[PDB]
Amino acid sequence: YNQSAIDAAAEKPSVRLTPTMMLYAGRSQDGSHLLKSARYLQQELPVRIAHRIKGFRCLPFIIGCNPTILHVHELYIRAFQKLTDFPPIKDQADEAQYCQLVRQLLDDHKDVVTLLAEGLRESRKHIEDEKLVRYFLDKTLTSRLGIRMLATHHLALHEDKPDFVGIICTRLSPKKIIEKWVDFARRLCEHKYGNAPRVRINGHVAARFPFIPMPLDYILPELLKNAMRATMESHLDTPYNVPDVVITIANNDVDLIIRISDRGGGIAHKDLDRVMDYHFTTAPMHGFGFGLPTSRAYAEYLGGSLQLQSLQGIGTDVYLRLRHID
Amino acid sequence: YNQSAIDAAAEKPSVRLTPTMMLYAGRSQDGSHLLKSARYLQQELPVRIAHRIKGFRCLPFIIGCNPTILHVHELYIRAFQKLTDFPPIKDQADEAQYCQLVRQLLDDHKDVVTLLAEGLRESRKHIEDEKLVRYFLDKTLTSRLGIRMLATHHLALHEDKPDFVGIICTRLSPKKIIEKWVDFARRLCEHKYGNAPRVRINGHVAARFPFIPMPLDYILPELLKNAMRATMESHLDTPYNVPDVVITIANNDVDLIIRISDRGGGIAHKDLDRVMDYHFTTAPMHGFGFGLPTSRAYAEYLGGSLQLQSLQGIGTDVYLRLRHID
Ligand SMILES: CCC1(COc2ccc(-c3csc(-c4ccccc4C(=O)O)n3)cn2)CC1
Ligand SMILES: CCC1(COc2ccc(-c3csc(-c4ccccc4C(=O)O)n3)cn2)CC1
Ligand SMILES: Nc1ncnc2c1ncn2[C@@H]1O[C@H](COP(=O)(O)OP(=O)(O)O)[C@@H](O)[C@H]1O
Ligand SMILES: Nc1ncnc2c1ncn2[C@@H]1O[C@H](COP(=O)(O)OP(=O)(O)O)[C@@H](O)[C@H]1O
Ligand SMILES: [Mg+2]
Ligand SMILES: [Mg+2]
């Protein structure tokens, strides 16, 4: 690329808007909170993009040369250009034009991860470091989550969604968000297998607290698709009589724990170390190998964890932990 | 100590009798299997003792000087002397005299761990390495388990216990051994709290396989005492209505998994890193701090693991894994 403008922002450090600082925006009888947030987003978005362009520049030359990798690298450069070229936000007209660019760039970059994984897969013969692919995809996925959180938050500040301040839900019920995806995952499972296991939810079912549901909107359907597929493939002779998937909610002052326990035979000993690798699968629902590593990258980025406990021959317990807001 | 006889056996490596090699002893119409095993035990017992005397010699001087530590060190030296002084086993008379010495030495050393922990506790002010105490107690406990397995196996070869070849049960049912300790632990819990949680056992309830129950005879009552105490202390207002402790058996070709799931509020975040430390407790049943670290040292020595999964505010799932025989 050899661009000096990008070099300037690759070294300047990132600024993360804390959940409490995000909530401290509600100047309704003025609209001054809208401009304050947009002025931050305008400055922060190119820094995040440049930090990732730096990652593409640090890829070994032979890999960075792949036409698909180069295309995604080019996309990140043009995105940085489009964002920095925009003049500073002064009024409601300057804020509105930025929101349109952000929405277009959020749609132009929707398939970056799929192109990146393909480019990296195509380059397997030249990849010497086994961790290279995992660390590059982990960092790309978490950078995008960070960007998508800031961008979606500012765009949602224009909506008057009940119980929400942008992307922060002030009254989130973990039981309701689980229920929302349980019915969705059962429909996908029913389509493939003719049936789906019934889901039972116990624990702190009435817990309510402020939280950002965005990461849970990815993790929960992925973990439910895994638990349901496994339960069906291990009860092939009785597809009509499959054991329930039991979800437990544990809410304490430190974190939120969601445990998903299935009776799907568990993860085999030989596969136990490969399940967290990108592309690894034993099979859209399945046939991807992204659900587990992406969900862990997500949980860890947000101060939590994704831990698996396999009981080979019986089932698996998946523990999703996420740190509380503030 | 400065004893040259012990120096000779501290360097000679250990020989471990594999489960299949132990089972290959049943020369009933001769009694030749009895002498072959005793001739091994006579040679192996001083090597194990010397390897541990070497550990006492490697303790920092200030700690090894503690009167309690010195007493246990002296006990190990006198044990090595008594065993090596015995003349080689040639007939049924020479085998019988060794069995009496082994039974006496197994009774003389019954309180070694309690004296050792006390001596180490007394020396806390001089202990600089935090891992020193954990590693010394882990190595002492596993050495003793190894010795107790060999000694008890040979002594049990004289018994005609059904479904057993010394200490190996040919038809072990994990459900039955769990049941055996469940009623025992409930009696101890009832004595302290006025009630105990009912225990539910599911999974591979009818699994049967060859196995050494000795380590399970320690781990299961300890893990059940922990799950029951926790369930009672978290349901103080309703001691009469406490949630069940649910045990799941998973039997596959690689290992045996026993999961103990309680609804006892879980292990607090602040205590989560200290629970595996010797002496750490939040309180004979309780007030010891040995149950968890000893059980893990045991599981790992036998090619398995002891893993804890805390759901703070709800309960804890404890996963005991043990590698299969052969
Ligand atoms: C060049 C900077 C831009 C584009 O930033 C992004 C960030 C995230 C996404 C996005 C769309 S769908 C999505 C996703 C969802 C679930 C799980 C994984 C992903 C993922 O693909 O990362 N993220 C798109 N553009 C602000 C203009
Ligand atoms: C000097 C070598 C000897 C003595 O060897 C041992 C080994 C083990 C034990 C023993 C008794 S009770 C026991 C225990 C049970 C459950 C959990 C922990 C322990 C423990 O104290 O290690 N182990 C005693 N003497 C063969 C003559
Ligand atoms: N609950 C589970 N029980 C059994 N196997 C599982 C479970 N969750 C995941 N797996 C295994 O891990 C593999 C990778 O999972 P994942 O990353 O979600 O991708 P996918 O399911 O789309 O292939 C799966 O193909 C499956 O073999
Ligand atoms: N199932 C459990 N639920 C909650 N706390 C537990 C559980 N198991 C162990 N603990 C905690 O770990 C501490 C140490 O346990 P352990 O080593 O068994 O010793 P003890 O229970 O005799 O004190 C206990 O004092 C208790 O605070
Ligand atoms: Mg998946
Ligand atoms: Mg205990």
Coordinates of all heavy atoms in Angstrom, one line a residue, chain B residues 3-28, unseen atoms left out:
Chain B
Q3 N 23.2 -41.1 55.4 CA 23.2 -42.6 55.3 C 23.5 -43.0 53.8 O 22.6 -42.8 52.9 CB 21.9 -43.2 55.8 CG 21.9 -44.7 55.6 CD 21.1 -45.5 56.6 OE1 20.5 -44.9 57.6 NE2 21.1 -46.8 56.5
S4 N 24.6 -43.7 53.6 CA 25.0 -44.2 52.3 C 24.2 -45.3 51.7 O 24.1 -45.4 50.5 CB 26.5 -44.6 52.3 OG 26.7 -45.5 53.4
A5 N 23.5 -46.1 52.5 CA 22.6 -47.2 52.1 C 21.4 -46.6 51.3 O 21.0 -47.2 50.3 CB 22.2 -48.0 53.2
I6 N 20.8 -45.5 51.8 CA 19.7 -44.8 51.2 C 20.1 -44.1 49.9 O 19.3 -44.2 49.0 CB 19.1 -43.8 52.2 CG1 18.7 -44.5 53.5 CG2 17.9 -43.1 51.6 CD1 18.4 -43.6 54.7
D7 N 21.3 -43.6 49.8 CA 21.8 -42.9 48.6 C 21.8 -43.9 47.4 O 21.5 -43.4 46.3 CB 23.3 -42.5 48.8 CG 23.5 -41.5 50.0 OD1 22.5 -41.1 50.6 OD2 24.6 -41.1 50.3
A8 N 22.1 -45.2 47.6 CA 22.1 -46.2 46.6 C 20.7 -46.4 45.9 O 20.6 -46.5 44.7 CB 22.6 -47.5 47.2
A9 N 19.6 -46.4 46.7 CA 18.3 -46.7 46.3 C 17.5 -45.4 45.8 O 16.5 -45.5 45.2 CB 17.4 -47.4 47.3
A10 N 18.0 -44.2 46.1 CA 17.4 -43.0 45.7 C 17.6 -42.7 44.2 O 16.7 -42.0 43.6 CB 18.0 -41.8 46.5
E11 N 18.6 -43.2 43.6 CA 19.0 -43.1 42.2 C 18.4 -44.2 41.3 O 18.1 -43.9 40.2 CB 20.5 -43.0 42.0 CG 21.0 -41.5 41.7 CD 20.5 -40.4 42.6 OE1 20.6 -40.6 43.9 OE2 19.9 -39.4 42.1
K12 N 18.2 -45.4 41.9 CA 17.6 -46.5 41.1 C 16.2 -46.2 40.8 O 15.4 -45.9 41.7 CB 17.8 -47.9 41.8 CG 17.6 -47.9 43.3 CD 17.8 -49.3 43.9 CE 19.3 -49.7 43.8 NZ 19.6 -50.6 42.8
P13 N 15.8 -46.3 39.5 CA 14.4 -46.0 39.1 C 13.3 -46.9 39.5 O 13.5 -48.1 39.8 CB 14.5 -45.9 37.6 CG 15.7 -46.7 37.2 CD 16.6 -46.7 38.3
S14 N 12.1 -46.4 39.6 CA 10.9 -47.1 40.0 C 10.4 -48.0 38.9 O 10.5 -47.7 37.7 CB 9.8 -46.1 40.4 OG 9.6 -46.1 41.8
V15 N 9.7 -49.1 39.3 CA 9.1 -50.1 38.5 C 7.6 -50.2 38.8 O 7.3 -50.5 40.0 CB 9.8 -51.5 38.6 CG1 9.0 -52.5 37.7 CG2 11.3 -51.4 38.1
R16 N 6.7 -49.8 37.9 CA 5.3 -49.8 38.2 C 4.6 -51.0 37.5 O 4.7 -51.2 36.3 CB 4.6 -48.5 37.7 CG 5.4 -47.3 38.2 CD 4.6 -46.3 38.9 NE 5.3 -45.7 40.1 CZ 6.2 -44.7 40.0 NH1 6.5 -44.2 38.8 NH2 6.8 -44.2 41.0
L17 N 3.9 -51.9 38.3 CA 3.2 -53.0 37.9 C 1.9 -52.7 37.2 O 1.0 -52.3 37.8 CB 3.0 -54.0 39.1 CG 3.6 -55.4 39.0 CD1 3.0 -56.2 37.9 CD2 5.1 -55.3 38.8
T18 N 1.9 -52.8 35.8 CA 0.7 -52.4 35.0 C -0.5 -53.2 35.4 O -0.4 -54.4 35.8 CB 1.1 -52.4 33.5 OG1 1.1 -51.1 33.0 CG2 0.2 -53.3 32.6
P19 N -1.7 -52.7 35.3 CA -2.9 -53.4 35.7 C -3.1 -54.8 35.1 O -3.5 -55.7 35.8 CB -4.1 -52.5 35.3 CG -3.5 -51.1 35.3 CD -2.1 -51.3 34.9
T20 N -2.7 -55.0 33.8 CA -2.8 -56.3 33.1 C -1.7 -57.2 33.6 O -2.0 -58.4 33.7 CB -2.6 -56.1 31.6 OG1 -3.4 -54.9 31.1 CG2 -3.1 -57.3 30.8
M21 N -0.5 -56.7 34.0 CA 0.5 -57.5 34.6 C 0.2 -58.0 36.0 O 0.6 -59.1 36.4 CB 1.9 -56.7 34.6 CG 2.3 -56.2 33.3 SD 3.6 -55.0 33.4 CE 3.7 -54.5 31.7
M22 N -0.6 -57.2 36.7 CA -1.1 -57.5 38.1 C -2.1 -58.7 38.0 O -2.1 -59.6 38.8 CB -1.7 -56.3 38.7 CG -0.7 -55.3 39.2 SD -1.5 -53.9 40.1 CE -0.1 -53.3 41.1
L23 N -3.0 -58.6 37.0 CA -4.1 -59.6 36.7 C -3.5 -60.9 36.3 O -4.2 -61.9 36.4 CB -5.1 -59.0 35.7 CG -5.9 -57.8 36.1 CD1 -6.5 -57.1 34.9 CD2 -7.0 -58.3 37.0
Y24 N -2.3 -60.9 35.7 CA -1.6 -62.1 35.2 C -0.9 -62.8 36.4 O 0.3 -63.1 36.4 CB -0.6 -61.8 34.1
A25 N -1.7 -63.1 37.5 CA -1.2 -63.8 38.7 C -2.4 -64.6 39.2 O -3.3 -64.0 39.8 CB -0.7 -62.8 39.7
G26 N -2.3 -65.9 39.1 CA -3.4 -66.8 39.6 C -2.9 -68.2 39.4 O -3.6 -69.1 38.8
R27 N -1.7 -68.6 40.0 CA -1.2 -69.9 40.0 C -1.6 -70.7 41.2 O -0.8 -71.4 41.8 CB 0.4 -69.8 39.9
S28 N -2.9 -70.7 41.5 CA -3.6 -71.4 42.6 C -3.1 -72.8 43.0 O -2.8 -73.0 44.2 CB -5.1 -71.4 42.4 OG -5.5 -72.3 41.3

